[PDB]
Amino acid sequence: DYALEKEKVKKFLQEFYQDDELGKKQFKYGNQLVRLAHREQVALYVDLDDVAEDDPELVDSICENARRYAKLFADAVQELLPQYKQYPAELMRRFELYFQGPSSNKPRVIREVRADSVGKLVTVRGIVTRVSEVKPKMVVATYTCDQCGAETYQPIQSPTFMPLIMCPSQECQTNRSGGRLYLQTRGSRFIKFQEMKMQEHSDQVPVGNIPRSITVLVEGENTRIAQPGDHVSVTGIFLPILRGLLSETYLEAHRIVKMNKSEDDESGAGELTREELRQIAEEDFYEKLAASIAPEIYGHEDVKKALLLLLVGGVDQSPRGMKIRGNINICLMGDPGVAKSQLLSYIDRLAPRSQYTTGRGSSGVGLTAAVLRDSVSGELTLEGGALVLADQGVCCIDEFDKMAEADRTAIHEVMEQQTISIAKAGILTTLNARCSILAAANPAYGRYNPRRSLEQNIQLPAALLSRFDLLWLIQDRPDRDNDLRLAQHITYVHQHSRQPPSQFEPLDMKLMRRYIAMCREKQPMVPESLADYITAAYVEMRREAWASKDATYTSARTLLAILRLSTALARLRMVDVVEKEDVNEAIRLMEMSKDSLL
Amino acid sequence: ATRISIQCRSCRNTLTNIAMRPGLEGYALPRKCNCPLDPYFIMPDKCKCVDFQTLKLQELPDAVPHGEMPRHMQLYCDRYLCDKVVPGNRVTIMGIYSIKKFGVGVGIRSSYIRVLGIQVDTVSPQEEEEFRRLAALPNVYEVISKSIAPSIFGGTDMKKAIACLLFGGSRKRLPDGLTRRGDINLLMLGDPGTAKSQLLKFVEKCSPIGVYTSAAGLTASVMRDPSSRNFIMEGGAMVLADGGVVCIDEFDKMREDDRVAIHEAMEQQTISIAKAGITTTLNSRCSVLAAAN
Amino acid sequence: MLPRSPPLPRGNLWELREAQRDYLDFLDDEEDQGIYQSKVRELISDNQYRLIVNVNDLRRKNEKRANRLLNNAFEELVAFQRALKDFVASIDATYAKQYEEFYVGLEGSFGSKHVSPRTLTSCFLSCVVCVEGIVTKCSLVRPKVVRSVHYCPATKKTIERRYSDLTTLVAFPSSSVYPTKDEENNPLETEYGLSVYKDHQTITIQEMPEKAPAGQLPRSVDVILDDDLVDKAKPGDRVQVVGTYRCLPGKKGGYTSGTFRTVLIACNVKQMSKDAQPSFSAEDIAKIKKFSKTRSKDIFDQLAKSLAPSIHGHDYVKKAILCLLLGGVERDLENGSHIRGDINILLIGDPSVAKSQLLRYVLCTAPRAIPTTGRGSSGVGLTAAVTTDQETGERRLEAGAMVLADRGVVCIDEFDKMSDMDRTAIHEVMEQGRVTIAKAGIHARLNARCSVLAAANPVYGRYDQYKTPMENIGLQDSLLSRFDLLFIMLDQMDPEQDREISDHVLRMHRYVSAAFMKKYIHVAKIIKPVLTQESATYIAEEYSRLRSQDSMSSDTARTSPVTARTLETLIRLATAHAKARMSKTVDLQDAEEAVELVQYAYFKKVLE
DNA sequence: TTTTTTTTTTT
Numbered sequence A: 001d002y003a004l005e006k007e008k009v010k011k012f013l014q015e016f017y018q019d020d021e022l023g024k025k026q027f028k029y030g031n032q033l034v035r036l037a038h039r040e041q042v043a044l045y046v047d048l049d050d051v052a053e054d055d056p057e058l059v060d061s062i063c064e065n066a067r068r069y070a071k072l073f074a075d076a077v078q079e080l081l082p083q084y085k086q087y088p089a090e091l092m093r094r095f096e097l098y099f100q101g102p103s104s105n106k107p108r109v110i111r112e113v114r115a116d117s118v119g120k121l122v123t124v125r126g127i128v129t130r131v132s133e134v135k136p137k138m139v140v141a142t143y144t145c146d147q148c149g150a151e152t153y154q155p156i157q158s159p160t161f162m163p164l165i166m167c168p169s170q171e172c173q174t175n176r177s178g179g180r181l182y183l184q185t186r187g188s189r190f191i192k193f194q195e196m197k198m199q200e201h202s203d204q205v206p207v208g209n210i211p212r213s214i215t216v217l218v219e220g221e222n223t224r225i226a227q228p229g230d231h232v233s234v235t236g237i238f239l240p241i242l243r244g245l246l247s248e249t250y251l252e253a254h255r256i257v258k259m260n261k262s263e264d265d266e267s268g269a270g271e272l273t274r275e276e277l278r279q280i281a282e283e284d285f286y287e288k289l290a291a292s293i294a295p296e297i298y299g300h301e302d303v304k305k306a307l308l309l310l311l312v313g314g315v316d317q318s319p320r321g322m323k324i325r326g327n328i329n330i331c332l333m334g335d336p337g338v339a340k341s342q343l344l345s346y347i348d349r350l351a352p353r354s355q356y357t358t359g360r361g362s363s364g365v366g367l368t369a370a371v372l373r374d375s376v377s378g379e380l381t382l383e384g385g386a387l388v389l390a391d392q393g394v395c396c397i398d399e400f401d402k403m404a405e406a407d408r409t410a411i412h413e414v415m416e417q418q419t420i421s422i423a424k425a426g427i428l429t430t431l432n433a434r435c436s437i438l439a440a441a442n443p444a445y446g447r448y449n450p451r452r453s454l455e456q457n458i459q460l461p462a463a464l465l466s467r468f469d470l471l472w473l474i475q476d477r478p479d480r481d482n483d484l485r486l487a488q489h490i491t492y493v494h495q496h497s498r499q500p501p502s503q504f505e506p507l508d509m510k511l512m513r514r515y516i517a518m519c520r521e522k523q524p525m526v527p528e529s530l531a532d533y534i535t536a537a538y539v540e541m542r543r544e545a546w547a548s549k550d551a552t553y554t555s556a557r558t559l560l561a562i563l564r565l566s567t568a569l570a571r572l573r574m575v576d577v578v579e580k581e582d583v584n585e586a587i588r589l590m591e592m593s594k595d596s597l598l
Numbered sequence B: 001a002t003r004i005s006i007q008c009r010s011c012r013n014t015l016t017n018i019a020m021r022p023g024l025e026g027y028a029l030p031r032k033c034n035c036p037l038d039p040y041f042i043m044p045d046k047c048k049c050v051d052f053q054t055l056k057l058q059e060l061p062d063a064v065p066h067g068e069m070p071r072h073m074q075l076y077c078d079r080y081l082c083d084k085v086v087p088g089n090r091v092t093i094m095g096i097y098s099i100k101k102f103g104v105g106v107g108i109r110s111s112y113i114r115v116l117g118i119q120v121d122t123v124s125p126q127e128e129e130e131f132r133r134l135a136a137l138p139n140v141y142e143v144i145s146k147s148i149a150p151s152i153f154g155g156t157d158m159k160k161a162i163a164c165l166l167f168g169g170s171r172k173r174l175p176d177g178l179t180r181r182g183d184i185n186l187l188m189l190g191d192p193g194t195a196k197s198q199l200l201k202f203v204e205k206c207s208p209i210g211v212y213t214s215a216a217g218l219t220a221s222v223m224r225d226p227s228s229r230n231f232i233m234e235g236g237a238m239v240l241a242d243g244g245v246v247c248i249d250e251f252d253k254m255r256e257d258d259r260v261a262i263h264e265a266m267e268q269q270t271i272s273i274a275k276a277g278i279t280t281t282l283n284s285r286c287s288v289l290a291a292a293n
Numbered sequence C: 001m002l003p004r005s006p007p008l009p010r011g012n013l014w015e016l017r018e019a020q021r022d023y024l025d026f027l028d029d030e031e032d033q034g035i036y037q038s039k040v041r042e043l044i045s046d047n048q049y050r051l052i053v054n055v056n057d058l059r060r061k062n063e064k065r066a067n068r069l070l071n072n073a074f075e076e077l078v079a080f081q082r083a084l085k086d087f088v089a090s091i092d093a094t095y096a097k098q099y100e101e102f103y104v105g106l107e108g109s110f111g112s113k114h115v116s117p118r119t120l121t122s123c124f125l126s127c128v129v130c131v132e133g134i135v136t137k138c139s140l141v142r143p144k145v146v147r148s149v150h151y152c153p154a155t156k157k158t159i160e161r162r163y164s165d166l167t168t169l170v171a172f173p174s175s176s177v178y179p180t181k182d183e184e185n186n187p188l189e190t191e192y193g194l195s196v197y198k199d200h201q202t203i204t205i206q207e208m209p210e211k212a213p214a215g216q217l218p219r220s221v222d223v224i225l226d227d228d229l230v231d232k233a234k235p236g237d238r239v240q241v242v243g244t245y246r247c248l249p250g251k252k253g254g255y256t257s258g259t260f261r262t263v264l265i266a267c268n269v270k271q272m273s274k275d276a277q278p279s280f281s282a283e284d285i286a287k288i289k290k291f292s293k294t295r296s297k298d299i300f301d302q303l304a305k306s307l308a309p310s311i312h313g314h315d316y317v318k319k320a321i322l323c324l325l326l327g328g329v330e331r332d333l334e335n336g337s338h339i340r341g342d343i344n345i346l347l348i349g350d351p352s353v354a355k356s357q358l359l360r361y362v363l364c365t366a367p368r369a370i371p372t373t374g375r376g377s378s379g380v381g382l383t384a385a386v387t388t389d390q391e392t393g394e395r396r397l398e399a400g401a402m403v404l405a406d407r408g409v410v411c412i413d414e415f416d417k418m419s420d421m422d423r424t425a426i427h428e429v430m431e432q433g434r435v436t437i438a439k440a441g442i443h444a445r446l447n448a449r450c451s452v453l454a455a456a457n458p459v460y461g462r463y464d465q466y467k468t469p470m471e472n473i474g475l476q477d478s479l480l481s482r483f484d485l486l487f488i489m490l491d492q493m494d495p496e497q498d499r500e501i502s503d504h505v506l507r508m509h510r511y512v513s514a515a516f517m518k519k520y521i522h523v524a525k526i527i528k529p530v531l532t533q534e535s536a537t538y539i540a541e542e543y544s545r546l547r548s549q550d551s552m553s554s555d556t557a558r559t560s561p562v563t564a565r566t567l568e569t570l571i572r573l574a575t576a577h578a579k580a581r582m583s584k585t586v587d588l589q590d591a592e593e594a595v596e597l598v599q600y601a602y603f604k605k606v607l608e
Numbered sequence D: 001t002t003t004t005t006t007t008t009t010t011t
């Protein structure tokens, strides 16, 4: 029976302690109930590990039914709220209650949830798709009899419902045996609502099987959490749909957590500690990170110094209404077997929003955005590409010299103005794609050769070569002793499955992904006194590449490199003004990028 | 269903042994149980059933008044008339011309012919010995190679060789499963002077299985189907000839892709296309008799 | 050939009270040899619903019941499954309540019931049959109620409801009204946690192709799997369903056409083809642990000699193909990186040097091998191509060749007749191990960890032994680095070799164990040896001597460039040579077995 | 289950 459960839950809600609050033993739900009573909060994520701390039996009978219990709880709190501080007891609810999954259960996959778990608390993992937009869903329809001056209500449960034409008040009927009552969208109560589908990760599917979907009815407060094309983990009941004996089923979400980083979303706990400010304040914080990027790869001390600036990014101006981009693009022209597709695979996992694409397996409309028709409706809709899904992040395109030439000029737009302007025959718009690109390519025919100069063992039209702030150029000439150190590194790796312990240790990925997000939001400035130094440097460049027989095409787009490649450094050192010591670091980089040819 | 039995739903009253009428006509379930309006359902456990087919009969070709496409009629076979005829047969039906009763115009019905009579129009021990003695007789070789090209004469070597292709070697499987060929290939180079087309026609006619080709192609193709809008697989001739013999002329006319694929098919003896949505294998087991130019 | 039993009979050695009280007596089974009391307990220890029975036993026990069960399957299987719950309560009543109802499969040898979907006439209605054939579709698994549990918030009572449809053994059509007010006074509310649902699928068996009379479109039949028999069959199999045959009527508007639809309510499934070799005997594992200990010096060479006896010469190539058939060890570091553990072999040479033969043998030896050519294969048909469906019309990603063959082998013959725009589609799937596709409405990453065995005819038709190894191969130095072993199967016209070659092939035309390498490599594959500092300093030296041009030679050309990618092919060949010995620790005798292979496969000599 | 128009992948 349940009458005694409504007491065993009130006990737990009024009695529970917790120590990690950083203070003494306060009441995790004691404060919550007050906040809810003062209408400063809407949802109450009752955790289930905490009920499983003093009563591991109630948890057994929740995840077994989870449909009655989610109502007993919303009655317990309904009674406790007045004791802290219309006719139907649901029109005056103005809060909702959600179960946060118990830790003992294990996250299933979409294929695993079978009929033996209909009506139980489950947990699935998947990729979102086709998230709808918020629409008002009714809960308590309020009618009025204009004749007898009254008010009536009715509560809704199904995805459909039949209205009323009674005015069942026996007085109005008895006096006159006549009268109709209107519906009304003021006294009623709506609640947010949106449906979204989930699909399996195409990784965890039998070798050639088709992925299965599931439907999720997000509503209340979980709305607007998940974006389409996203890794997510959902916790909610698994019910059948109302209205022979076969039934179609949907997942009724109670909790939605983004698991993009392969672990969780820890943006709340993302704050750094003073014991880490220790490191960030050290003299050469910029040089520790550089060495702690893909440590499995020997050498390349300078490339890792630039792949960090790409992750931090310069600052972006807007004077007199003339936008200047504040991202950095980098190419890695180099010989075969120098671990470029390793560096890129690493920079993919070290970015909040990232994408990976291959030149030979992606078409030019699949990078930017494509217009596609629906044979069910005949209506053309837009569908973002790679550069759109990687809006505020990084995109990675290896095998960049092998991409078809008509599918490569579709990047010139995204690299300068950072929009995508579509004018096909359904749509006319400009999407926002503020991504910073990182690409890898092989020089001429697989291998650099010293007969032909540059620009002919690179084969990029100047218009695209100049879009890249740093076209880094790696070579591998055999060396009787360097090869020895490289081998003694790789064999250590294959023995221990780790890199050899140097003087210090690389930071964890989880920690760098936070060190950087803290280091983005500074926005330093530029001092006027430097405009004479910078200038001269730039001028000197226009001399060399004008009085040489190998140099690339340099233009007035190179100055903004020096400028935006230094506001990155000055952003690492946590300064709030660019200093003359970073301009020289930038200038050294733009020089250490073509020295591999001399 | 021939002898069907129903049952009420609410009060559980049965009314059994009901007999269906033959042909294509259903049954009108009561609505007066003696319970809601139509309380009757069928009890699947108690209903005797018999087979029934449904053919389609086209009128003979020499009786169309020759301005149009022949008309056809629909039949309805029963217990022992089922699986008695195969599409391509000539028959003589005795049926009851009748009408469908499943109750362009206002009072139009459908019509079929309930068939109740059907007709069809049209190795040995001692035969073994005429093979035995002929295989045993001293000059067994030339007797065949003489009677395998009556019209064309000259250079019996080009007829000596063709005698072997009709028999072929034997298929061996080493311990490794590394099977060996069991067929031969022949090329008759030279000007096209029509002296060879006769020979192709002969070897095709006198073969256990054989096809003479100059449509879909020889080897398999991948074609965009109008209905599916996707790619489907078309096994050509060399997959239909199982152990048989395939004859070819004008060895430079065949489609470039097709010639590549026939090269690989004579190489490996199977065709494996790995394209848009197609990854299959088709064993090609036939004999190539080619004529060049 | 007639399959008159699910267990292939040739080489198996290498009222309703009488029925219910006879089945119980049969299920006692204690007093004769205890065959089933050894199976009821066995399934209770595994938490199964159903047990498989042999009707061959029912015959010897009681012929009358064995005949009455193959001709009235419904009334007999509703009494079998009752006197089975009865007999499981007679062991553990606590377990006998965890499950709603038990089930009972069947297997054995039915007399005339072994039919095909072509012979399944309407004289088999309500009769156990045993249909054979290919599955050619599946349905979407969906629940189906068999009981509800309601609740009255006002009266605090609890009413139930039992459901039944035409797909039961009792067949009464109940209505799914879900009562909300039994008596008009009180309101109800369903409780899903306490109700009972079950699974439900619908597959379509179809007659075997080589058994059709070839004149028609082979016949089909509809099966209704259920209750954890569900996902037991995928499209393209060869199953032997053993289920009752049934006709299910209908009525649209009070007027029924006599025509019915007949289905097969399966109660067992069997894959006919045995598609694995893990069932080694203890005698076999004994032999294996003997052979792996006898001699650690010569077991690799002895393994490779017996690889392809049907071929003469080419000892090196057989050695390397064995190394392929074993494989290295895939290391995945802690941060998430990944290093491949496969070997990709390339063979070039003049015509008729048994290249296609080696390929066709590696196909049959290894499990999960896929063949492919150089013209019947496009650059996209190898990896993955985007298409749509006919029923739904929404796009999806059909898997190419090199994604089906995951954890397997892909054999590409005439790898040179493949256009330049088609090789490039491989550079991602041959090293990084996974395919990335960003097409119009598709953004996916498929796992394709495989290994490539490729054969290519040289340019100029024949290998001009005077030009150079680089001009005889068209591949660019970016693709030539992926394939870590390049074997130039040069053909030589010295009169001696032809003599023994003719001897060998002619002996072959006059007709270690063969079926033992299968088990031995299927066992030695799982071992994961670990490097040791005695050899890891020898490899780190042989590489730095390979990378130095001077130490090579003069009058010696290079077939392929030596990069930091051949370094971890040394490591792969080594830990694939210490997998034959079942050693688990690579030693200096390994890191030297795998260096001569390289020294031979990398450097060629030019003549004039 | 048909035309006609428009976008994108594929032989």
Ligand SMILES: Nc1ncnc2c1ncn2[C@@H]1O[C@H](COP(=O)(O)OP(=O)(O)OP(O)(O)=S)[C@@H](O)[C@H]1O
Pocket (backbone or CB within 6 Å): A296, A297, A298, A299, A335, A336, A337, A338, A339, A340, A341, A342, A441, A442, A486, A490, C339, C431, C478, C481, C564, C565, C568
């Ligand atoms: N300096 C290095 N440190 C660590 N691993 C290395 C180094 N050089 C090469 N490797 C390894 O050698 C292999 C190189 O493969 P990739 O990273 O795919 O080469 P790549 O730079 O992509 O060459 P291309 O452009 O695709 S031909 C990987 O297994 C790397 O781990």
Ligand SMILES: Nc1ncnc2c1ncn2[C@@H]1O[C@H](COP(=O)(O)OP(=O)(O)O)[C@@H](O)[C@H]1O
Pocket (backbone or CB within 6 Å): C310, C311, C312, C313, C350, C351, C352, C353, C354, C355, C356, C357, C501, C505
């Ligand atoms: N060294 C050899 N050992 C055994 N058989 C051989 C050898 N060389 C050629 N053969 C035989 O000759 C034929 C050669 O065909 P194959 O080598 O497969 O052609 P390709 O080299 O063009 O693929 C095969 O039937 C094979 O049995």
Ligand SMILES: [Mg+2]
Pocket (backbone or CB within 6 Å): A340, A341, A398
């Ligand atoms: Mg690469």
Ligand SMILES: [Zn+2]
Pocket (backbone or CB within 6 Å): A145, A146, A147, A148, A149, A150, A167, A169, A172, A173, A179
């Ligand atoms: Zn009123």
Ligand SMILES: [Zn+2]
Pocket (backbone or CB within 6 Å): B008, B009, B010, B011, B012, B013, B033, B034, B035, B039
């Ligand atoms: Zn009745």
